[PDB]
């Protein structure tokens, strides 16, 4: 009754019909032979894969609760363990999502935008200072994306220099590198055998643990300084809701969901945002004309004497369409984040046993040639009608769909916009590599472009 797909061997599963290139490339290859919806065996585990804008939507939207179930990721389950907004399920998840969605919106009393505009203003100020000397943005873009989350959870930001922050940051974002490595992906398949032998997991473990300590401490500092009647941020609030569920012990709001939820926010809403920015600027180096037009749109719709604001977007459909296409091509989460089916489930003739894991190749949507003329080529065109207004697009689900749809799409949207329009507002770019020779070819649960040098040339 499971989707078709090559024969499993026990212990190993479909190890053999996979591609050395990687988890993503493997699926897409099986899709060719076995179709839009197949079953593939990751050792013991049967996984059903959803390729295409229809397949994915039919599950995530047309059957959204069936498919609301989060799945595991092997290298980090030992840290997260089913706790926290991201890896939660059933009741645990809903109450956590309900909470975070509500909470982050309100408190943190400067508005989510404002905090971003401030963070961008600092960026401009910090960038100015390098007087147009080559640099790898990676750090700063980790920094700003991290300072944003920080502002939400801790009620504060960090200077780009303060070196404690950087030490922690450095080792936070070392984890992602490792999370998306080949070793991790092998670990994914056979972690029952590998958890005993040394390998990147242990390293990932101790990087996260180390953070969960600093957080642990920021939580203890919060309780001891708390003003109930005037909360500052996400932790203040989770605490106040914690005491308001004192008498109830089947409630979900305990210390361990607090910690792994604050961590969770860093873990989802940093790299991915940051890498999108990194990638974005890489594309603006390679096709300057776009940049020119964006800088130009900025001159018309915003001018040069005020900062960008989130409202300027509605009137800047080109820029907006670039940011859209940046996400699409960046394809930064390419096989989405594992799902499970909360019930036994009817789908396309097939039946998927309860809790079976489900992988929505989002990349197959992003490069759906029915919704994008030139899917492998960078093309704002993809998002613009005959009158040059923004164009919706079914194939555009980088933040995924259904009930597990990215909780942050929003910050990230606002971030991407306000960072992009504000940087470009103030600096033009250049680099050693001529546009013609810049290469974009990156692959793991997150994709990553190459490292590159760049120049931020102040404009007067």
Ligand X SMILES: OC[C@H]1O[C@H](O[C@H]2[C@H](O)[C@@H](O)[C@H](OCCCCCC3CCCCC3)O[C@@H]2CO)[C@H](O)[C@@H](O)[C@@H]1O
Q: Which does 398 bind (CB under 5 to 8 A by kind): ligand HEM, ligand X, none?
A: ligand HEM
Among residues 120, 263, 323, 337, the one that binds ligand HEM under rule CB under 6 A: 337
Among residues 160, 165, 335, 456, the one that binds ligand X under rule CB under 6 A: 165
CB 126 within 8 Å of CB 207:
no
Using rule CB under 6 A, residue 214 touches ligand X: yes
Q: Report the residue number, 8 or 137, with the smaller CB distance to ligand HEM.
A: 137
Can you say whether the dihedral through the CA atoms of 238, 418, 166, 87 is positive or negative? Answer: positive
Sole window of 285-293, 305-313, 395-403, 448-456 interacting with ligand HEM (rule: CB under 6 A): 395-403
What 204-208 contacts at long range (C-beta under 8 Å, 24+ apart), as own/partner pairs, is 204/75, 204/76, 204/79, 204/175, 204/178, 204/179, 205/78, 205/79, 207/171, 207/172, 207/174, 207/175, 208/76, 208/79, 208/172, 208/175, 208/263
Among residues 147, 400, 422, 443, the one that binds ligand HEM under rule CB under 6 A: 400
Q: Which residues contact 164 (CB under 8 A, 6 or more apart)?
A: none
- Residue 210 C-beta: closest distance to ligand HEM, Å: 21
Q: Report the residue number, 49 or 333, with the smaller CB distance to ligand HEM.
A: 333
Using rule CB under 6 A, residue 211 touches ligand X: yes
Using rule CB under 6 A, residue 269 touches ligand HEM: yes
Q: Which residues contact 351 (CB under 8 A, 6 or more apart)?
A: 1, 2, 344, 345
Using rule CB under 6 A, residue 155 touches ligand HEM: no
Total residues in contact with ligand X, by rule CB under 6 A: 22
Strand 339-340 and strand 357-361: the pairing is antiparallel
Q: Which does 146 bind (CB under 5 to 8 A by kind): ligand X, ligand HEM, none?
A: ligand X
Sole window of 136-144, 262-270, 350-358, 374-382 interacting with ligand HEM (rule: CB under 6 A): 262-270
Alpha-carbon gap, residue 106 to 327, rounded angstroms? 27
Sole window of 46-54, 174-182, 267-275, 294-302 interacting with ligand HEM (rule: CB under 6 A): 267-275
List the structure tokens of 182: 């080949």
Q: Report the residue number, 133 or 164, with the smaller CB distance to ligand X.
A: 164
User: Binding to ligand X (CB under 6 A): which residues in 23-82?
Assistant: 23, 26
Closest of 287, 279, 277, 306 to residue 426, by C-alpha = 306
Strand 427-430 and strand 455-458: the pairing is antiparallel
CB 50 within 8 Å of CB 28:
no
Q: Which does 386 bind (CB under 5 to 8 A by kind): ligand X, ligand HEM, none?
A: none
Can you say whether the dihedral through the CA atoms of 445, 449, 450, 451 is positive or negative? Answer: negative
Q: Report the residue number, 179 or 265, with the smaller CB distance to ligand HEM.
A: 265
Alpha-carbon gap, residue 430 to 28, rounded angstroms? 36
Using rule CB under 6 A, residue 406 touches ligand HEM: yes
Q: Report the residue number, 204 or 323, with the smaller CB distance to ligand HEM.
A: 323
Q: Which does 8 bind (CB under 5 to 8 A by kind): ligand HEM, ligand X, none?
A: none
Using rule CB under 6 A, residue 189 touches ligand X: yes
Sole window of 14-22, 247-255, 286-294, 446-454 interacting with ligand X (rule: CB under 6 A): 14-22
Among residues 109, 133, 164, 229, the one that binds ligand X under rule CB under 6 A: 164
Alpha-carbon gap, residue 323 to 383, rounded angstroms? 10
- Residue 303 C-beta: closest distance to ligand HEM, Å: 28
Q: Report the residue number, 355 or 431, with the smaller CB distance to ligand HEM.
A: 355
Among residues 80, 176, 372, 399, the one that binds ligand HEM under rule CB under 6 A: 399
Among residues 48, 153, 265, 352, the one that binds ligand HEM under rule CB under 6 A: 265
Using rule CB under 6 A, residue 95 touches ligand HEM: no
Where on the chain is the footprint of ligand HEM (CB under 6 A)? 70, 85-86, 97, 265, 268-269, 272-273, 276, 332-333, 336-337, 360, 398-400, 404-408, 411-412
Q: Point out which residues bind ligand X (CB under 6 A).
A: 15-20, 22-23, 26, 146, 158, 164-165, 168-169, 172, 185-186, 189, 211, 214, 266
Binding-site members for heme are 406
């Amino acid at each position: 009754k499971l989707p078709p797909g090559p024969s499993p061997l026990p212990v190993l599963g479909n190890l053999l019909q996979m591609d050395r290139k990687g988890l993503l490339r493997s699926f897409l290859r099986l899709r060719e032979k076995y179709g839009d919806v197949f079953t593939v065996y990751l050792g013991s585990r049967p996984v059903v894969v959803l390729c295409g804008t229809d397949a994915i939507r039919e599950a995530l939207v047309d059957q959204a609760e069936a498919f609301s179930g989060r799945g595991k990721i092997a290298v980090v389950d030992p840290i997260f363990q089913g706790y926290g907004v991201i890896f939660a399920n059933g009741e645990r998840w809903r109450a956590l999502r309900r909470f975070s969605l509500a909470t982050m919106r309100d408190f943190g009393k400067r508005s989510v935008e404002e905090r971003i505009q401030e963070e961008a203003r600092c960026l401009v100020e910090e960038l100015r200072k390098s007087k147009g000397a080559l640099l790898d943005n990676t750090l700063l873009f980790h920094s700003i994306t991290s300072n944003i989350i920080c502002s939400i959870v801790f009620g504060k930001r960090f200077d780009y220099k303060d070196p404690v922050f950087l030490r922690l940051l450095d080792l936070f974002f070392q984890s992602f590198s490792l999370i998306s490595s080949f070793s991790s992906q092998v670990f994914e398949l056979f972690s029952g055998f590998l958890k005993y032998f040394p390998g990147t997991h242990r390293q990932i473990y101790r990087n996260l643990q180390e953070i969960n300590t600093w957080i642990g401490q920021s939580v203890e500092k919060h309780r001891a300084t708390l003003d109930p009647s005037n909360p500052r941020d996400f932790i203040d609030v989770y605490l106040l809701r914690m005491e308001k569920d004192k008498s109830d012990p089947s409630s979900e709001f305990h210390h361990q969901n607090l910690i792994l939820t604050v961590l969770s926010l860093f873990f989802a809403g940093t790299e991915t945002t940051s890498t999108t920015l990194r990638y974005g600027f890489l594309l603006m180096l390679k096709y300057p004309h776009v940049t020119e037009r964006v800088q130009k749109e900025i001159e018309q719709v915003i001018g040069s004497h005020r900062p960008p604001a989130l409202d300027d977007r509605a009137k800047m459909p080109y820029t907006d369409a670039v940011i859209h296409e940046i996400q699409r091509l960046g394809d930064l989460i390419p096989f989405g984040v594992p799902h499970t089916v909360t019930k036994d489930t009817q789908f396309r003739g097939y039946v998927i046993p309860k809790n079976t894991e489900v992988f929505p190749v989002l990349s197959s949507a992003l490069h759906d040639p029915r919704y994008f003329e030139t899917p492998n080529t960078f093309n704002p065109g993809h998002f613009l009608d005959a009158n040059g207004a923004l164009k919706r697009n079914e194939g555009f689900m980088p933040f995924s769909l259904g009930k597990r749809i990215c909780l942050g799409e929003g910050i990230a949207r606002t971030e991407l916009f306000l960072f992009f329009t504000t940087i470009l507002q103030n600096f033009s770019i250049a680099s050693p590599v001529p546009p013609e020779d810049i290469d974009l070819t990156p692959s793991g649960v997150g994709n990553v472009p190459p490292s590159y040098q760049i120049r931020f040339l102040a404009r007067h």
